[PDB]
Design a protein around this ligand. Sequence first.
Ligand SMILES: *[C@@H]1O[C@H](CO)[C@@H](O[C@@H]2O[C@H](CO)[C@@H](O)[C@H](O)[C@H]2NC(C)=O)[C@H](O)[C@H]1NC(C)=O
Ligand SMILES: *[C@@H]1O[C@H](CO)[C@@H](O[C@@H]2O[C@H](CO)[C@@H](O)[C@H](O)[C@H]2NC(C)=O)[C@H](O)[C@H]1NC(C)=O
Ligand SMILES: *[C@@H]1O[C@H](CO)[C@@H](O[C@@H]2O[C@H](CO)[C@@H](O)[C@H](O)[C@H]2NC(C)=O)[C@H](O)[C@H]1NC(C)=O
Ligand SMILES: *[C@@H]1O[C@H](CO)[C@@H](O[C@@H]2O[C@H](CO)[C@@H](O)[C@H](O)[C@H]2NC(C)=O)[C@H](O)[C@H]1NC(C)=O
Ligand SMILES: *[C@@H]1O[C@H](CO)[C@@H](O[C@@H]2O[C@H](CO)[C@@H](O)[C@H](O)[C@H]2NC(C)=O)[C@H](O)[C@H]1NC(C)=O
Ligand SMILES: *[C@@H]1O[C@H](CO)[C@@H](O)[C@H](O)[C@H]1NC(C)=O
Ligand SMILES: *[C@@H]1O[C@H](CO)[C@@H](O)[C@H](O)[C@H]1NC(C)=O
Ligand SMILES: *[C@@H]1O[C@H](CO)[C@@H](O)[C@H](O)[C@H]1NC(C)=O
Lengths: 728, 726, 201, 201
Amino acid sequence: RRTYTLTDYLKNTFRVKFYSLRWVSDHEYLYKQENNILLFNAEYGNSSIFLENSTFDEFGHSINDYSVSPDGQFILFEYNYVKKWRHSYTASYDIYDLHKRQLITEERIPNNTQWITWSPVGHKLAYVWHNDIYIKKEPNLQSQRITWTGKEDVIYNGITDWVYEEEVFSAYSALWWSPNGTFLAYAQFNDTEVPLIEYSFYSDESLQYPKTMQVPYPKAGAANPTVKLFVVNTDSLNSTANATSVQVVPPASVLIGDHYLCDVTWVNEERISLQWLRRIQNYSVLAICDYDKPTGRWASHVRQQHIESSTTGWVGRFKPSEPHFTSDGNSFYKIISNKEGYKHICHFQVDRENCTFITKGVWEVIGIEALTSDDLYYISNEYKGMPGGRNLYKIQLNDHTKVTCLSCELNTERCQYYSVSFSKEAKYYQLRCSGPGLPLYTLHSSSNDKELRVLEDNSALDKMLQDVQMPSKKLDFIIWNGIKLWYQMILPPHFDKLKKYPLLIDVYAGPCSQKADTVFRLNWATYLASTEKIIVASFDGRGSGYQGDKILHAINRRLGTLEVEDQIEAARQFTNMGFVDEKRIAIWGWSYGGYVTSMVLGAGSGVFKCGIAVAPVSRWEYYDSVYTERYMGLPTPEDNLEHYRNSTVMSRAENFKQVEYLLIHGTADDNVHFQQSAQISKALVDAGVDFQAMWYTDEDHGIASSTAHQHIYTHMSHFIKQCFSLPE
Amino acid sequence: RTYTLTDYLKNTFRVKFYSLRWVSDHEYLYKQENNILLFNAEYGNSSIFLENSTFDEFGHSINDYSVSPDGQFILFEYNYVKKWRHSYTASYDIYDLHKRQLITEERIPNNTQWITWSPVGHKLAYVWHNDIYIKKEPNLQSQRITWTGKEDVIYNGITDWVYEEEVFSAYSALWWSPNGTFLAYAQFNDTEVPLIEYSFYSDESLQYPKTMQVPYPKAGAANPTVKLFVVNTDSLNSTANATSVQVVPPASVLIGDHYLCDVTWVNEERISLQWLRRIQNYSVLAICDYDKPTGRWASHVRQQHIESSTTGWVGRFKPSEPHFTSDGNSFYKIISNKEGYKHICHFQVDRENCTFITKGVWEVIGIEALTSDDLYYISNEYKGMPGGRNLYKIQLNDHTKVTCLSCELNTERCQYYSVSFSKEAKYYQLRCSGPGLPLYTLHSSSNDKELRVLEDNSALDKMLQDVQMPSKKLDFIIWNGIKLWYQMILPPHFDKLKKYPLLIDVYAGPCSQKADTVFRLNWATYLASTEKIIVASFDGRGSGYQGDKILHAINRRLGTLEVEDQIEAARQFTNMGFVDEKRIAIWGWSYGGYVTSMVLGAGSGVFKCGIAVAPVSRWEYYDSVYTERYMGLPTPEDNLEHYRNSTVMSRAENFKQVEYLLIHGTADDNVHFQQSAQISKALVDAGVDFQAMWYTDEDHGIASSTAHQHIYTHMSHFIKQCFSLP
Amino acid sequence: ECDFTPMLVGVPPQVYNFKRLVFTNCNYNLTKLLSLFMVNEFSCNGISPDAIARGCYSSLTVDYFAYPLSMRSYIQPGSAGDISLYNYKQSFANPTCRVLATAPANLTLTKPSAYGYFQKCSRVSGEHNSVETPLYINPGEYSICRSFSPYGFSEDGEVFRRQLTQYEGGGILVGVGAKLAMTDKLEMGFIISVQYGTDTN
Amino acid sequence: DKECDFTPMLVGVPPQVYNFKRLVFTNCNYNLTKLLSLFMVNEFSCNGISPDAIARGCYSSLTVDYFAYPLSMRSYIQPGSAGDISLYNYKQSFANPTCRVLATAPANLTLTKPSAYGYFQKCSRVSGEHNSVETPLYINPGEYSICRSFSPYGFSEDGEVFRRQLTQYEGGGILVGVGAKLAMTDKLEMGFIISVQYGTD
Ligand SMILES: *[C@@H]1O[C@H](CO)[C@@H](O[C@@H]2O[C@H](CO)[C@@H](O)[C@H](O)[C@H]2NC(C)=O)[C@H](O)[C@H]1NC(C)=O
Ligand SMILES: *[C@@H]1O[C@H](CO)[C@@H](O[C@@H]2O[C@H](CO)[C@@H](O)[C@H](O)[C@H]2NC(C)=O)[C@H](O)[C@H]1NC(C)=O
Ligand SMILES: *[C@@H]1O[C@H](CO)[C@@H](O[C@@H]2O[C@H](CO)[C@@H](O)[C@H](O)[C@H]2NC(C)=O)[C@H](O)[C@H]1NC(C)=O
Ligand SMILES: *[C@@H]1O[C@H](CO)[C@@H](O[C@@H]2O[C@H](CO)[C@@H](O)[C@H](O)[C@H]2NC(C)=O)[C@H](O)[C@H]1NC(C)=O
Ligand SMILES: *[C@@H]1O[C@H](CO)[C@@H](O[C@@H]2O[C@H](CO)[C@@H](O)[C@H](O)[C@H]2NC(C)=O)[C@H](O)[C@H]1NC(C)=O
Ligand SMILES: *[C@@H]1O[C@H](CO)[C@@H](O)[C@H](O)[C@H]1NC(C)=O
Ligand SMILES: *[C@@H]1O[C@H](CO)[C@@H](O)[C@H](O)[C@H]1NC(C)=O
Ligand SMILES: *[C@@H]1O[C@H](CO)[C@@H](O)[C@H](O)[C@H]1NC(C)=O
């Protein structure tokens, strides 16, 4: 096409190719080619077939995923996939033998399995079914029930509740095998007193009476689910008796009230690292627990406890960072805040409370990626002082002053945003470059840090984009009150600084979020800039992360304050830059982004003509506890109830009479409930304010169904094409 | 100066009425400036029955009153809380007329569901917590009659949801005897009736919303069972329990699911019950006599009366109620004649046949008063216009002598009448409502003379002289040999030469009439006066008051004909020269939204935009009593295929040509938000863009002041943008 | 010497489920049975008054059931009501005696939960099920609605329904029950009919 | 004058290790060996005196600390032993000639078995600004644990947590205590700590 059209984005015309691999050893990996699982050798790139697609289609079902046992002798086949919430899902499983090249029909894995995983060595299987854990010593053998207390929507064994999957664990799993599979740690969640959100699901046209969903959801201040961590010995099992699980009690400083389990890290087969976080999330404790062979318990001693807190805000970015232990298990490295306030790597000892920092500067370490007996690999935003960039670094564990970047100068103009995937023992690492150019996947060797070959160069997309007028990206910063705040502009093709374009402020503005980056994207903003000639701009004001504790903790105990004002100030700054039409400035967002957009449209600053709020927040008393209370505390008069009430969207309803407002929300949203947008429209009606609205029947937080995804962006296109008076 | 939208939403030009309550054969009560006044009908002299200073001194705003028949006590209603259309709960304090005191001994409890006096004396029967209580004297203890009362399961003296909305059109299910010897009541059992469940979000202070649960019988679902009981109130030993005898319906309706649609007391030892099958093609009226030594009420086959429909349903919605002569051995009833028109028939108790006294190519709307020599009835016979209502009187001795009592009082101003007679039918008040300003007059039945004018709206007339008000044409068009009627609200200074945009207002439900002679000051008045839009309505097939052959044309075929006639009317309106064929729209509420959606989904290219407010989408989603009356049961052995054919979602692809606005309330208990939720899901599945709006916690009316003014303001911007009106 | 033990033992039947004891050759002796009941009514008719104490001991048939005295007016000859049409109707072709009596304490007679009679027993037939032809009993015979609830009714006004097969005429049989409260003493009713013969006795 | 009776150690349910009951006797003489025959002694270490010279001698006092103790935990009651028992439950004192006896009670003896065994995993004090300082509270020889009042009879589950606010007079902060539960053995295993002083009665 001549320009990047909406059809080109809604339907996928210009596709980005990826190279996803699974490291199965220290020098080999698996890769799927035309539904053929292929085994590659990292050194010389020579490959061989691991499973043919003739095998894939002897079944009577569509295979969704696969999982090879860490012994190379069995393959787990996933099918009957059924989505539930963000990470959770239920599916069936069939175990496939590789030496016999057959399926196992003796003692199968039941339907509607919630979680399943292999032991880190061998072929042991532990899975969660009906909120209970079952362990299979051998695939052909019957499973042994580990827990017997599991109840639907009350007690979860091995799996998370809603708030643990969404906000603290970012996963549906709570199973942790030991490094050799002798012990199996798991968490038990009790949602008995947790209140229930009840919304409606209308389903297919055949359903006469709709359905009422019930999700144990702790809103702001509500009762939280209690958590216990049990460890069971898988090598002392007996099919004749019931299995015994031992509970590891948390440290006493966290048992004074409500708390959370935010991390579980195995050090060795008799030492396990647990990270507990209080309900008021500015005090965490990494508890190192050692097993006792005589009694069979796990001892959490205060002498091996390490306190990580924060006086200016919350611990970590979204939670305390996970530990990274050495081989001996008597020390670990983790990312905490320095005295200046920047996230850097500190060197802890198991029995000494203090830690030594190995990195420093006006930059942050994004994540520790590998730790060997001599080198530590970490990803940071240090290169060129750009917070929106990421590169791989290597630091010598004996001379910390010897740091070498491994991805900065490989292709400085094409790649400034890197991830990595190390092989076992960190012998080979795959570099995944996201932007600012077309994505580039390469494989390297850790010995000499030399690149071996290009895995994916996206050559097909480069030739497809030659005859299209693509929009450019301007990544720069401004200085507001002596503070560097970065922005990002997607400039239309043949951008002329003399002309005045309509501006669309893309906003999320959530805590630790980052909208200004060096990442390539073929999104809806690409269509608005290429075809309709609209400058799309994002701005990382106060509260944005990857820049230090000062900027991140500027919205502590006060959400809906500085991040809203900085979005208003950014539009003024973009206006007086020269190439923005002051009369046509809009702003749209999703979830927290829609919340800020509703707060901006309710400020009455006259800068914005229209705005679109998609599944927005309206009152922080309506959102879940773990997320809201982390930044705003408890909504009681003895804490921060007043800031909960000054930061409502309903309280600014009268100012919406100056703007054109589009409110969108899914009827089956489980994260930000339709009650949030229901109170918004109920306030604007009580104030005599007109607006446009659109509900989507039985849609979740992301309107991600194919029919609904195209409908929400075609509707928002017409709203912007009218608000900006553009030809239809 | 034109009739603006602000004048309609802020109620600037207000119409006046005169609501009275006949307390005798020649007296009535009138609430004037918060003073209850007694009037002598013959001469018009008034008395202060109760004053200003009496009310507004109790500590709460009084909602309504109920003077006892003996003029000794008044009920005082307050703490009013609405619930569905007719139901509500409130508090009550009794006031003694003689002692001038508020009774404080054994007060009526809070959250009382229903209360009523006996037809004579000062006896009270109220329903509290789904149980009936009898209060003989206002200062004595009430006597509990029932003990099976349970919320959303058993209803004693009150109705459930589907009886209140569709069968009884009232929350009440209590019927006193003519002079208070007995109290007939019904009992409803909603144990196996499924529950509709929707969310209520309440005020901003509520963290977790509430899930409302109402026992709702959808098409084919389990219906509530009905049992009628009679209790002797004059044999009420205050130390014993109350005994309720049950009246068994005849065997013709006990073969399956049946309804109770009428309870009319004939005399103190005779009661009239009308029963209706679940398939509403067959009805029975049972005249039950009392048995003193036995104590029961028996329905015998000789005093039973069968009325059924071979082309549709019995009655316009339910079978018509009877009116018994003062001796109790005969009654007059509105049934359908051989040619399909509904007229008055003279029934005997133990004779199966009846004799029609009224006959013609018109229909009798209702029987109003029955004396020994005259029967008073409202009809639409005048000028052959089905949209009119006039009072008639007929001699029972010589049926030929029939007199119209209202046809020529002010034929230019008054063509739509309603009447309110006094006791023994001595005096009657005529309530005209169009096509002129409403005129309320008082009359006398002897000489049939107008005594005085009670209300003429002289203030509204003066206010409407300096505003460019629109006009209203009421004509007809013959099509395929049948005469159908329509009405247009023409803009002021109507030029027959210029092309105007057209908005078609539609309801089109069974036995509806959107073409009448009633004065209105509504949204269509603003659209015609200010925006110069022609607002028109059409009553095609399915509309009533024109004969069974026209009403029963949509039987078991809803979504057909009634939708096509709205499309064909738009074409014939274009054939009149003053309609812009490129600016035609359609809008409706409830059934109107259903027909509007089916019209827009028909792909006829006649309509550009359209609005559907709280519309029905699939008839399996709506309640049983209404839907099954016109469509039967949704089974492959009945009419399942036309349930599936007449869905709005089936026509979602044709919406790519129209601009569609869909509005629905989130707390709608009648046409649930589910109905609109499936419409939008089909429009998204079909790749169709449209406009939508939800109103939080709003009922089927969207009638809250802020909400009512928000929906018409939104529909104004949509129609104007669709019509390129600034 | 034909002891009437069955009429004296167990819970008595309801009027619609009346039981009959027919004796042909066995010699009978009354007054023995009469001495067991307080005759609140001994209205004999037909041919023999109290001379029924004798005869030739030929075809002595006796019906017995539980019948309250509050309904005594509906067991008399020619009496209208729901007993004569749907429960019991005495046959006045042969000599007969109608006996109503209350029972003394623990006269090995059990107490029914309550009394019961059918107030309606009709057929809903015809096309569209419009014709309701009430089914009245014949003297001496039973009711067609007897099959519904012989034990009794759980509620006054208990409705019953059954499809009358093609060999049963067609349509729907509807029977409505009526329930009377239990009297403090067991009240009964007996009909004693006797026939003659052309051979012996 | 009389005979020191050991009956409270033989009747009822014995206390837990952290809630041990203590009997001190004066102005009487004892028959110590008849108690040893009642139980199956599994250990008898006597620091300060001899395993034999304890049953003979007139003293100024004779004390016996008795409680229910499992033999699977016998190593954690030994002298100088670390672990949870000596830190938050019971630590034997050596300021006097003493013995330590772990014995099993037969069903012939009239002492009942408790529901299960119990000891305290943790008994710490959370203090300091922001409740960051946590100091475990260790018991002194012969004394009681300060977490004793949380669950006297026993614990309901393993890892049971108890919290309590320490008053201003009790120093400050929050006292935290975690319990531990062991399955009850076949026969009741007990623990006896005998001590002795002097002064010639
Ligand atoms: C899940 O939580 C509930 C409490 O919320 C626990 O139920 C309690 O059980 C005890 C023992 O029977 C009772 O004394 C309490 O009354 C119960 N509380 C409630 C609210 O029911 C339950 O034991 C917990 N389950 C697990 C596995 O920990
Ligand atoms: C964690 O945050 C809470 C705020 O919720 C801090 O509590 C405050 O503590 C100071 C004492 O230094 C009091 O003066 C404030 O009144 C407290 N605030 C509230 C809302 O109670 C707590 O100190 C923080 N903890 C750390 C380790 O920083
Ligand atoms: C109209 O006038 C008649 C008299 O012609 C009134 O009758 C009397 O009304 C007064 C006031 O209500 C009563 O106190 C008398 O008892 C009435 N007279 C008799 C003989 O009973 C009639 O009430 C008047 N109507 C009003 C005032 O509304
Ligand atoms: C309302 O109807 C229900 C049936 O839906 C009646 O409940 C039944 O009662 C009978 C006899 O008592 C039982 O055998 C059934 O098991 C009951 N069914 C159910 C679902 O409860 C109930 O008695 C009726 N109530 C009234 C007042 O008539
Ligand atoms: C009752 O309504 C039904 C229509 O719903 C009519 O019953 C039909 O009767 C004819 C007899 O000629 C049958 O062939 C049809 O199959 C019946 N319809 C159904 C749906 O079963 C009947 O006309 C109505 N009853 C009366 C008295 O008018
Ligand atoms: C199966 O794999 C072969 C090997 O490359 C490939 O040519 C073929 O297209 C594949 N077919 C399917 C259905 O995956
Ligand atoms: C899963 O369910 C299907 C039918 O619902 C059944 O055929 C299949 O056997 C089930 N899976 C197992 C492992 O039993
Ligand atoms: C009755 O009271 C109202 C105010 O409550 C007052 O305005 C009015 O004048 C009173 N009526 C008369 C007739 O005075």
